[PDB]
Amino acid sequence: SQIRQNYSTDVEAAVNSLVNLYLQASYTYLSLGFYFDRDDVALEGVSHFFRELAEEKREGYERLLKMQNQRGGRALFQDIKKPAEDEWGKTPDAMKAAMALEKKLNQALLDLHALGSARTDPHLCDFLETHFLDEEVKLIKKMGDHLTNLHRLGGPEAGLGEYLFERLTLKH
Amino acid sequence: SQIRQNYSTDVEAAVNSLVNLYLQASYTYLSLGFYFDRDDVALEGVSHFFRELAEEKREGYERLLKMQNQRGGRALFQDIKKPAEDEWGKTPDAMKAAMALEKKLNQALLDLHALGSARTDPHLCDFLETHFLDEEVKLIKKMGDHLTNLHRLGGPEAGLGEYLFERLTLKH
Amino acid sequence: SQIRQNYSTDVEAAVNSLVNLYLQASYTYLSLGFYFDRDDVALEGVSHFFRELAEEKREGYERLLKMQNQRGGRALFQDIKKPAEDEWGKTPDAMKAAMALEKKLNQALLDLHALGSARTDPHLCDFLETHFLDEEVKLIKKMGDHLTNLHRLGGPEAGLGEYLFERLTLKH
Amino acid sequence: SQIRQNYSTDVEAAVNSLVNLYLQASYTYLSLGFYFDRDDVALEGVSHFFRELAEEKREGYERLLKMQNQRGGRALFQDIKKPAEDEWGKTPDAMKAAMALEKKLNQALLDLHALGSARTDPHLCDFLETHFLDEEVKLIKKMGDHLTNLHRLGGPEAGLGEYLFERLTLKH
Ligand SMILES: [Fe+3]
Ligand SMILES: [Fe+3]
Ligand SMILES: [Fe+3]
Ligand SMILES: [Fe+3]
Ligand SMILES: [Fe+3]
Ligand SMILES: [Fe+3]
Ligand SMILES: [Fe+3]
Ligand SMILES: [Fe+3]
Ligand SMILES: [Fe+3]
Ligand SMILES: [Fe+3]
Ligand SMILES: [Fe+3]
Ligand SMILES: [Fe+3]
Ligand SMILES: [Fe+3]
Ligand SMILES: [Fe+3]
Ligand SMILES: [Fe+3]
Ligand SMILES: [Fe+3]
Ligand SMILES: [Fe+3]
Ligand SMILES: [Fe+3]
Ligand SMILES: [Fe+3]
Ligand SMILES: [Fe+3]
Ligand SMILES: [Fe+3]
Ligand SMILES: [Fe+3]
Ligand SMILES: [Fe+3]
Ligand SMILES: [Fe+3]
Ligand SMILES: [Fe+3]
Ligand SMILES: [Fe+3]
Ligand SMILES: [O]
Ligand SMILES: [O]
Ligand SMILES: [O]
Numbered sequence: 001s002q003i004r005q006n007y008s009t010d011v012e013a014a015v016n017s018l019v020n021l022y023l024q025a026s027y028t029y030l031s032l033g034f035y036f037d038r039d040d041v042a043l044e045g046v047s048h049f050f051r052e053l054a055e056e057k058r059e060g061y062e063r064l065l066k067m068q069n070q071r072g073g074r075a076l077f078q079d080i081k082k083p084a085e086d087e088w089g090k091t092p093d094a095m096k097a098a099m100a101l102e103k104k105l106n107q108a109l110l111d112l113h114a115l116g117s118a119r120t121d122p123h124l125c126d127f128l129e130t131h132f133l134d135e136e137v138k139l140i141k142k143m144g145d146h147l148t149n150l151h152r153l154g155g156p157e158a159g160l161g162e163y164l165f166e167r168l169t170l171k172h
Numbered sequence: 173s174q175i176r177q178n179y180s181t182d183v184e185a186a187v188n189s190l191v192n193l194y195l196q197a198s199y200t201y202l203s204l205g206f207y208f209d210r211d212d213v214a215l216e217g218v219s220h221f222f223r224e225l226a227e228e229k230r231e232g233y234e235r236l237l238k239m240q241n242q243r244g245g246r247a248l249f250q251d252i253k254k255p256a257e258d259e260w261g262k263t264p265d266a267m268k269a270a271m272a273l274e275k276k277l278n279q280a281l282l283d284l285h286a287l288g289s290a291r292t293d294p295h296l297c298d299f300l301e302t303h304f305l306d307e308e309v310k311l312i313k314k315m316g317d318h319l320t321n322l323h324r325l326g327g328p329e330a331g332l333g334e335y336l337f338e339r340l341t342l343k344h
Numbered sequence: 345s346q347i348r349q350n351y352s353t354d355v356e357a358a359v360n361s362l363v364n365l366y367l368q369a370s371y372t373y374l375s376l377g378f379y380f381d382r383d384d385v386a387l388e389g390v391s392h393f394f395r396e397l398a399e400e401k402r403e404g405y406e407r408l409l410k411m412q413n414q415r416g417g418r419a420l421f422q423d424i425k426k427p428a429e430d431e432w433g434k435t436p437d438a439m440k441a442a443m444a445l446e447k448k449l450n451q452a453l454l455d456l457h458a459l460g461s462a463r464t465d466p467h468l469c470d471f472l473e474t475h476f477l478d479e480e481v482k483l484i485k486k487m488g489d490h491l492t493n494l495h496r497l498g499g500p501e502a503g504l505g506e507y508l509f510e511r512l513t514l515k516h
Numbered sequence: 517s518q519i520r521q522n523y524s525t526d527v528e529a530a531v532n533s534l535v536n537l538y539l540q541a542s543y544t545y546l547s548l549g550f551y552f553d554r555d556d557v558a559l560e561g562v563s564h565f566f567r568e569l570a571e572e573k574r575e576g577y578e579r580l581l582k583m584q585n586q587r588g589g590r591a592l593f594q595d596i597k598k599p600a601e602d603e604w605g606k607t608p609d610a611m612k613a614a615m616a617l618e619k620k621l622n623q624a625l626l627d628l629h630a631l632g633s634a635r636t637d638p639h640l641c642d643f644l645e646t647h648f649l650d651e652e653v654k655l656i657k658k659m660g661d662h663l664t665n666l667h668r669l670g671g672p673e674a675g676l677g678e679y680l681f682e683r684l685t686l687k688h
């Protein structure tokens with residue numbers, strides 16, 4: 001590139017990888033989104049929650065792609081692996097799947113910050129600090145709070161709790 | 173003071189004491205406030221309730237400090253004792269702790285009115301009558317009502333009741 | 345915590361410590377605030393300056409407590425040590441006390457950034473960088489400017505300078 | 517009176533006395549007001565301060581007269597004693613005269629509250645508590661603050677301080 005400066009081939013390839021990971025997470029959220037709208041699941045607020053996460057994740061990869069172009073990197077796409085399940089169980093299960101996905105995304109973000117820090121790339125570090133890390137922290141805190149409210153509503157009287165949580169906590 | 177008039181050294185020192193008591197109650201409410209926002213407690217409305225009480229208590233001590241200055245008293249600060257617990261249990265427990273704290277504040281207010289009455293200080297008596305006593309009565313009535321609603325929602329099906337009360341009674 | 349990730353027990357405890365330090369500074373500012381409103385001190389603008397600092401410091405600890413909850417830390421409170429003086433002298437003295445307090449807060453902030461940097465916690469580093477460090481720099485620069493204006497107004501004609509500075513520099 | 521109830525002849529006569537005292541204070545403030553507008557005194561803000569006090573004191577006696585009528589008392593007027601001085605010196609002197617007058621008014625108010633308390637007349641006590649006592653406290657605190665600012669501006673460079681205080685503190 002006529003423009004590339006302080007932009008290591010390692011960051012470029014790790015950014016390409018994080019992009020595939022965002023694409024895959026978006027895809028997972030899409031699947032959870034339509035799943036909770038099945039006539040036999042029918043939890044509109046849960047469906048909305050996950051549709052919104054698919055949308056947020058898309059913004060993630062679009063922003064990584066834009067930063068790749070701005071630094072003089074070359075985007076390279078791989079296949080997007082289908083989501084890990086085709087049925088997602090009940091709200092607690094789905095929510096725990098989502099937690100696990102967000103934890104993996106967060107680790108991948110932290111790993112890429114560590115790497116850019118190690119290649120003294122402060123622009124890349126700042127970029128992640130600004131557009132990604134706090135977003136992850138806030139979102140994980142929110143899923144944790146959700147898991148705590150579902151747990152409190154679970155046990156013997158499981159079905160009623162799931163209805164109430166979707167109705168009184170999730171936006172529909 | 174060039175300004176002090178009918179202001180006994182006893183009232184002045186008791187006002188200093190009530191100030192430390194307000195500081196301490198504010199501090200207790202702060203602690204209850206963040207506690208109910210822990211990812212493993214996650215009761216936003218309860219957290220809001222107690223944050224608001226911390227704020228109200230701060231107004232209390234600021235008003236006592238201002239009246240101290242207006243009467244020609246000298247403020248004197250002591251250490252603020254940390255709250256009595258670091259974990260606050262469930263909503264009923266926290267609410268009973270709050271009740272007990274408010275009852276102690278009310279007794280301390282009544283005691284200071286008695287004392288100013290005994291030093292024939294009608295300004296101090298009126299000041300408490302106007303800015304403190306009815307506030308205490310209204311607030312204790314509210315915590316009592318809350319305790320009655322939690323009791324009605326308690327027993328075997330404890331977790332569900334706590335969710336509903338936070339959702340349908342507390343402002344979030 | 346179901347949510348904690350990359351959050352060292354050292355940062356958590358140092359955050360708890362910084363919280364007690366903010367509580368203590370807020371308390372010091374409260375004391376300076378009412379002091380300058382005594383009928384025998386009577387410098388409304390100075391009183392306003394310090395009341396505002398008490399308020400800002402409270403925002404500080406509330407933000408640290410919120411970040412503690414978001415990271416999955418557990419808040420732990422200690423006693424709040426009373427302010428170091430009960431009488432604060434003249435504006436120059438108070439202002440130098442405030443400078444010293446802000447310098448200690450700044451060092452404690454820098455130390456905690458160093459520590460999170462050493463535990464490769466970029467979220468914590470960014471958090472301080474964003475909500476604390478520049479605030480400290482701006483405020484210390486402002487107290488320094490104030491000290492320079494008081495010095496210029498001091499010396500033989502001390503009392504007049506203190507009146508003018510409160511009237512023509514501080515917001516009342 | 518067809519209306520009088522729980523209204524002792526002692527309160528009635530003490531209310532008549534407090535009225536003459538308010539009339540006299542109003543008269544004193546009138547005198548201080550025009551004095552500071554003499555071409556050879558020429559302190560507009562000081563003049564305004566005292567004119568305003570004359571006005572406030574008039575409201576005082578009008579309110580006592582109205583309450584006398586409402587309780588079924590009979591107003592009785594005596595002569596109004598001329599003010600104690602015809603020349604009032606400099607701002608510090610006038611302000612100390614005003615302080616002394618307000619202290620005497622406050623004592624007379626406290627004495628009348630004590631008396632109505634002793635005749636178990638809660639209406640009269642409340643009336644004073646509501647329309648008089650806090651007004652006195654606030655005003656004395658304000659004169660004290662003023663005296664502190666004048667003192668700080670006094671000494672060798674007396675004339676300049678008096679100009680600045682009238683210009684930068686008093687409303688003109
Ligand atoms: Fe959307
Ligand atoms: Fe969105
Ligand atoms: Fe967005
Ligand atoms: Fe969007
Ligand atoms: Fe399957
Ligand atoms: Fe950085
Ligand atoms: Fe509030
Ligand atoms: Fe409030
Ligand atoms: Fe309020
Ligand atoms: Fe408020
Ligand atoms: Fe414990
Ligand atoms: Fe009353
Ligand atoms: Fe009253
Ligand atoms: Fe009363
Ligand atoms: Fe403010
Ligand atoms: Fe502020
Ligand atoms: Fe602020
Ligand atoms: Fe603010
Ligand atoms: Fe001392
Ligand atoms: Fe940064
Ligand atoms: Fe930054
Ligand atoms: Fe007027
Ligand atoms: Fe008026
Ligand atoms: Fe008026
Ligand atoms: Fe008026
Ligand atoms: Fe004379
Ligand atoms: O978004
Ligand atoms: O409030
Ligand atoms: O603030």
Ligand SMILES: [O]
Pocket residue numbers: 571572575
């Ligand atoms: O007035």
